[PDB]
Symmetry: D2
């Protein structure tokens, strides 16, 4: 399995040790408190009240945890995924990213602690 920190200010995202292959089943658990700028913190589901002003993922709130798998678009993670299977032709290294507007990561703070494992299949 993989365990590590995803910094909210890391615009390129945190590459994991997990290479998602066809057929794989994965489980993700994400925890902790982070900010996209304000003097408040939100969990891995982000800020349900903040407008989307050009987020890297339009299917999750500002300040949410998302991922890319190889060459994929952003996929919501939020608090995690339980025994999850990717779409046809989605494969490669999993990168975890804090959901924010491109070029606005410099004022972000905090992190999420994330676990990923491959399940039985």
């Amino acid at each position: 399995a993989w365990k590590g920190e995803v910094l909210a200010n890391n615009e390129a995202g945190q590459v994991t040790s997990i290479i998602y292959n066809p057929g794989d089943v994965i489980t993700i658990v994400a925890a902790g408190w982070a900010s996209y700028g304000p003097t408040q913190k939100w969990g891995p589901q982000g800020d349900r009240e903040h407008p989307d002003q050009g987020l890297i993922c339009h299917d999750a709130f500002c300040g949410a945890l998302v991922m890319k798998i190889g060459n994929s678009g952003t996929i919501p993670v939020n608090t995690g995924l339980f025994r999850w299977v990717a779409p046809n032709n989605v494969q490669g290294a999993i990168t975890l990213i804090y959901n924010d507007v491109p070029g606005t990561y410099g004022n972000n703070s905090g992190s999420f602690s994330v676990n990923i494992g491959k399940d039985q299949s």
Copy 2:
């Protein structure tokens, strides 16, 4: 595995199908939005700003997800637990509970969607 809803207004908590036995390894993923009363919602980590005025679990925020295993005290769950093992002499049915002050559940709303599975061991 078990999947189900934990209602924020359910003071007795939601009993699951998971009977935790000595040696078991479990994974929990919790998601969603709930309130302990106010016209705002919080995720399974609850409200980090709200004081503890007699919460059923003093190790988690008001509005967080917690659990009991058989005859145990409350144990924080928050967003989930990854490949977790219980203390010596903690065993029995897992019950999931919204963290609030006893007798104050009537104004709560929303729910968490929760998955629990037993891992390889």
Copy 3:
């Protein structure tokens, strides 16, 4: 998980650390060479040519690996069990036993090397 040897000459069998609980999924893999008395040795399926009379397990060949769960009757194991759930109401420690006629274990020789693990469930 558990790994150990089951001696063919051990009439009482080898009690393991694995406690089979309701709902558990287990995998067993057994290997090696043993005899119920002749100079030949057989694997964990035993001797398909030997008559069935007086064996501790009528549903496996003489020289096969079998088990008990708690105080159950004998259950065939043979080369192993893949992601197995008990079809009967059984609970308790797994004991591994060589299948032979009671009182005839003293001329037996060799052993099986066995792995047991609990699977995801």
Copy 4:
């Protein structure tokens, strides 16, 4: 997971649906009765009394179950593999094969029933 039969008389072996990828943990359980020509049958460990000459796998007995991962050399399987990680740099489809001398498969008979699954990792 994959379940199927490996015929002893099939020199090319049975290609499975399981693609072994770097880091995968697999479990294999094999059962049944087969012959490399004689009237006797043996289990998936084969015949411990048969000489080693000309077999497709020098590290297993004649009549044993072996495999290839992609275009690898033969790898012993015997009764199975418990939570196994490839110790060598191998990737690709698992092919299951009966261990015999090339060109001598036509007098073989019987089969092994095999389960393969990917384990948690």
